[PDB]
Design a protein around this ligand. Sequence first.
Ligand SMILES: [Zn+2]
Ligand SMILES: [Zn+2]
Lengths: 146, 146
Amino acid sequence: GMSLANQIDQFLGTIMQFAENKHEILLGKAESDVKLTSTQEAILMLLAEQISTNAKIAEKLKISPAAVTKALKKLQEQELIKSSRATNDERVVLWSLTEKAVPVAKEHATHHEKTLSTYQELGNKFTDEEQEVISKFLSALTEEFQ
Amino acid sequence: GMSLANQIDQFLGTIMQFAENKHEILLGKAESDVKLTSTQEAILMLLAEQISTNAKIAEKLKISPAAVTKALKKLQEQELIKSSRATNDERVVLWSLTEKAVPVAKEHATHHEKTLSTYQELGNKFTDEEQEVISKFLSALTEEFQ
Ligand SMILES: [Zn+2]
Ligand SMILES: [Zn+2]
């Protein structure tokens, strides 16, 4: 609608219809089939880069042992990750991706990367002063939604 | 996140979580209980202001007779509107809200009005040049979502 208030309202409407029956907000095929919680997904992506421990994971993603534990449980049940014993210390447990998960992580990261780069490109059309205005607009509108 | 691309991505995430299991994007109680399609809702709101005909409705909301018809059917089944015969011409059918619907329309309009005024207030913090930037940002980002 022509007022900014109306435009803002229509834009949210557009996003709502787009998010309907989707797991995340992504641009593209939505061919990132598997449906993971944010934590599970962060862990998956984290392990896709490096083998790590329960405490290393909690640290890296600034979450509690409880949360890491619950997430590792689920990922393991879905055969996306697998535990193994630290070559140097029988007591410490290492985690990593299963074979079938490696490409699943890759394909789904790309999707995120394509979505981010589209936002980057749109952003690049605006000067720094303009990006600041957009930024202050998004923070303030973000506050209304909690 | 600090880049604008990351901020844009987080902002959409925020809206997605907010829209989850909601009918529309509204600020407030969500105590606008009844769930109507956009057309049904537009008709309800339209009839809340004025009694009108099938062809008057189609005109006003720029939609087809088929669409008006389907919408009137549903609204009537839910006892939100009621037909009556034009005092001046037995052939033309008038529509209007039922008693129980009058306050339902009012309460739900207010909700929309409160949501719009919040966007208006946020918008008023920005000069016209800044609102133009925001506007051009929203149009372009809107295009990505279709
Ligand atoms: Zn994802
Ligand atoms: Zn509504």
